[PDB]
Amino acid sequence: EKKKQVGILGGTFNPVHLAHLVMAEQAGRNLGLDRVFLMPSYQPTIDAKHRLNMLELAVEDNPFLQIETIELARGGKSYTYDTMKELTQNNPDTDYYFIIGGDMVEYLPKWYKIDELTSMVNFVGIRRPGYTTDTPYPVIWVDVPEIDISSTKIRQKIKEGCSIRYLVPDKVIDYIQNEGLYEY
Amino acid sequence: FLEKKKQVGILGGTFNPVHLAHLVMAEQAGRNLGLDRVFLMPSYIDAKHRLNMLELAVEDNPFLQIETIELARGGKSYTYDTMKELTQNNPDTDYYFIIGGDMVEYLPKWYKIDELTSMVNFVGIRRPGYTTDTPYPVIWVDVPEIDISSTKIRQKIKEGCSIRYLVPDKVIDYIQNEGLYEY
Numbered sequence: 001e002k003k004k005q006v007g008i009l010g011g012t013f014n015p016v017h018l019a020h021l022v023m024a025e026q027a028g029r030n031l032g033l034d035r036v037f038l039m040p041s042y043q044p045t046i047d048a049k050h051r052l053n054m055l056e057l058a059v060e061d062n063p064f065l066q067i068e069t070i071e072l073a074r075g076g077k078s079y080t081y082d083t084m085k086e087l088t089q090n091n092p093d094t095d096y097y098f099i100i101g102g103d104m105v106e107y108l109p110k111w112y113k114i115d116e117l118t119s120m121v122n123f124v125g126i127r128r129p130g131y132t133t134d135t136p137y138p139v140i141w142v143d144v145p146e147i148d149i150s151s152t153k154i155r156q157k158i159k160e161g162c163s164i165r166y167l168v169p170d171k172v173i174d175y176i177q178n179e180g181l182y183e184y
Numbered sequence: 185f186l187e188k189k190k191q192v193g194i195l196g197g198t199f200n201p202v203h204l205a206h207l208v209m210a211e212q213a214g215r216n217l218g219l220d221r222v223f224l225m226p227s228y229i230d231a232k233h234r235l236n237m238l239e240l241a242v243e244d245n246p247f248l249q250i251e252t253i254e255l256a257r258g259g260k261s262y263t264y265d266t267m268k269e270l271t272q273n274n275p276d277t278d279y280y281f282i283i284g285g286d287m288v289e290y291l292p293k294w295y296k297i298d299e300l301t302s303m304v305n306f307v308g309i310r311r312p313g314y315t316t317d318t319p320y321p322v323i324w325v326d327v328p329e330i331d332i333s334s335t336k337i338r339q340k341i342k343e344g345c346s347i348r349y350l351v352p353d354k355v356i357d358y359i360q361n362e363g364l365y366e367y
């Protein structure tokens with residue numbers, strides 16, 4: 001009877017870090033969604049199982065944030081259309097809110113089958129005070145605190161031996177260090 | 185009048201390969217109990233092949249879907265952890281864990297069975313008149329006996345024996361097209 005309102009945040013999460021969690025939590029809470037899943041892609045190569053373990057530790061203590069593993073099980077290079085075709089078929093009770101960066105919204109016409117895809121999901125853009133919100137696609141907008149941490153920067157910091165504390169959750173740091181990830 | 189939880193079946197197994205008895209079990213268990221859906225859940229040859237056969241087997245049946253969480257974790261997956269994640273992923277869902285009646289008496293040896301039994305409802309597949317010592321509450325579903333096992337299919341394929349009607353036609357094709365099981 002409940003039509004579930006569930007956010008989806010895609011990406012590689014290579015590794016997961018603070019901005020991923022703030023984006024997901026704030027976008028979903030600000031819109032009043034029921035839950036947000038971080039959905040790691042299989043190939044955008046650090047092992048998928050490593051990225052999955054880090055993610056699960058990152059959202060461990062938070063019932064609001066869960067992990068959606070379908071792209072890691074399906075393997076290959078699942079296009080977003082195929083992923084939400086299967087997710088909407090598995091979950092006919094669910095309205096999906098696909099959360100993307102405001103800078104990603106201008107590349108929407110490059111997405112495979114984007115026209116069919118806007119029929120399956122609701123696109124949620126993260127507003128940047130550095131651009132308009134105008135676009136042909138049916139996108140709704142949310143504000144979230146600017147957290148300018150990138151996984152690229154995190155990886156080089158790890159390679160150089162620089163601190164990543166508080167930029168990355170403690171248990172994720174522990175896993176990175178125990179497993180020697182990212183040239184550690 | 186209030187919120188109805190969705191009522192969802194889960195059939196675990198290896199599905200190496202999926203065959204007609206898997207499909208009869210999932211469909212009979214779910215329809216006879218009035219469930220909303222049944223998911224076949226392969227445990228963790230290549231996992232991608234088992235996945236592709238499962239998806240082919242259930243393509244034309246919107247009642248049967250595939251649950252791939254155990255393939256994604258990529259490791260020995262204890263039913264407790266699996267059902268932990270799914271109930272937390274789907275707190276609005278009552279889960280029905282379908283197992284063969286012949287495994288039902290072995291449930292108390294499962295990892296953390298007593299937290300599991302508060303997390304799901306066990307459904308016991310049974311041929312009428314089957315008896316077993318099971319002093320755990322179980323939802324029993326009668327199903328015609330269909331004595332098809334993946335071991336027999338695999339070796340039928342390894343011997344060139346026919347498997348028509350024991351295995352869905354689209355699964356036979358994919359097996360053939362891929363050289364699966366030493367064909």
Ligand SMILES: NC(=O)c1ccc[n+]([C@@H]2O[C@H](COP(=O)(O)O)[C@@H](O)[C@H]2O)c1
Pocket residue numbers: 070087089090091092093190191192220221223250251252253270274277
């Ligand atoms: N009507 C339905 O098919 C229905 C209802 C409630 C929950 N679900 C959930 O949908 C999930 C399927 O999603 P994934 O295959 O991507 O994990 C299943 O785990 C199941 O618990 C399905």
Ligand SMILES: [Mg+2]
Pocket residue numbers: 326
């Ligand atoms: Mg009867």
